[PDB]
């Protein structure tokens, strides 16, 4: 239907299509695809895994029984021992740090399992397993509809404004539809995003820059937001790609020096961006949610397919417009439908759980994104 094609293409330009993964359907449900996995360093091979187990867990009680040439592992990373009794000269009691130090001081060495051809063919060895696992899920396409095209006396006004009115009205109605779609997406993102948390939530409580705390400049929020990016990087093979925040949470708060208000837009920003941060990823703004939050997260693609996102969007067309001229009221209806979902497997151990849930069920997907985090913010209101 060319008119749906034209209206849709000319209207979805108004929604945050890039803060979700974009996929499409032609079915009553959307077949969504995506990737998740358990960890992030070195190999995912079983033989290598066993080797890790066959060398040592590196308990502090054993860290000093190691000598030159030995291997050890910790948190699934294999490290090699340089000279004897590594850590003998490191006073640090917390192995996580003692190891950090040992690597810096060259007492140990990050171990590479790159190997000769001989290693593999000679032992007729195993081969590495997947670092990633790929999922598919099916989420129903839901509709949302408008009866917003009021015409009657308004039709006469539209005739008076007949210069523009035919399409003007549809474009306007379509604009309101875009708004609702965008808002719908944002609610889902808010819900799915994992709560960014550090030491009991962002330094032992949601960040608070209120008058009862730190009505500073907004610098401390920018710092927390930048850390949200760190979190994405530490947890996944991606850097944050986008950020959305309320006007008070960042569009204005970061105006203090950590936000550029779109000095350029024919390069690297979406047309619906507010601007971008000083450690910028395009900054978008919801303007509705009472939370005054910040979301940091990532969409990504393999060739044309946006296989990565916390939320996925898949519209189904055959922006449909209709008229119902009862009495003197030839009003215009607008119908749009799409599937919206999170990867349901982030709340499932296997298919026997995934098959009884729905990525579009935001009661179950709440806080389980892993491709995005949300920061609650107490502002100086």
């Amino acid at each position: 239907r060319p008119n749906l094609v034209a209206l849709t293409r000319a209207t979805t330009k108004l929604i945050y299509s890039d803060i979700v993964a974009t996929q499409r359907t032609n079915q009553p449900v959307a077949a969504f695809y995506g990737i998740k996995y358990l960890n992030g360093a070195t190999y995912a091979g079983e033989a290598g895994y066993v080797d890790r187990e066959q060398i040592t867990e590196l308990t502090e009680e054993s860290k000093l029984t190691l000598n030159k040439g030995d291997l050890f592992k910790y948190n699934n990373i294999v490290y090699k021992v340089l000279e004897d009794t590594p850590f003998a000269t490191i006073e640090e009691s917390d192995l996580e740090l003692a190891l950090q130090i040992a690597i810096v001081l060259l007492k140990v060495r990050l171990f590479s399992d790159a190997a000769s051809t001989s290693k593999f063919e000679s032992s007729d060895s195993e081969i590495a397993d997947a670092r990633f696992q790929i999922n598919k899920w099916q989420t129903a396409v839901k509709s949302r509809k408008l009866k917003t095209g009021i015409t009657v006396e308004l039709a006469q006004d539209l005739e008076a404004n007949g210069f523009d009115a035919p399409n003007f009205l549809e474009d306007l109605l379509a604009t309101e539809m875009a708004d609702e779609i965008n808002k719908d997406i944002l609610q889902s993102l808010i819900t799915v995003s994992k709560r960014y948390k550090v030491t009991g939530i962002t330094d032992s409580g949601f960040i608070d820059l209120s008058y009862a705390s730190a009505p500073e400049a907004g610098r401390s929020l920018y710092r927390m937001v930048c850390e949200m990016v760190s979190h994405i990087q530490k947890e996944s093979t991606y850097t944050a790609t986008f950020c959305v925040a309320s006007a008070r949470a960042a569009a204005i708060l970061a105006a203090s020096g950590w936000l550029k208000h779109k000095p350029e837009d024919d390069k690297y920003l979406s047309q619906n961006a507010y601007g971008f941060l000083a450690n910028g990823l395009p900054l978008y703004c919801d303007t509705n949610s009472p939370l005054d939050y910040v979301i940091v997260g990532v969409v990504e693609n393999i060739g044309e397919k946006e296989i990565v996102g916390s939320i996925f969007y898949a519209p189904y067309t055959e922006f449909k417009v209709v008229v119902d001229p009862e009495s003197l009221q030839p009003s215009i209806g607008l119908l749009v439908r799409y599937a919206l979902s999170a990867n349901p497997y982030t709340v499932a151990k296997d298919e026997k759980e995934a098959r009884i849930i729905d990525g579009g069920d935001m009661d179950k997907m709440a806080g389980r994104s892993d491709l995005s985090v949300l920061l609650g913010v107490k502002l100086p209101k």
Binding site: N26, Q27, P28, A31, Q138
Partner: peptide, 23 residues
């Protein structure tokens, strides 16, 4: 093989239609 609707799918999920009475 032939006593059912077929309505072959071109994708899992995927669906069939039926002329269910209003009841």
């Amino acid at each position: 093989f032939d006593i059912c609707g077929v309505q072959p799918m071109n994708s899992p999920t995927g669906q069939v239609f039926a002329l269910r009475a209003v009841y």
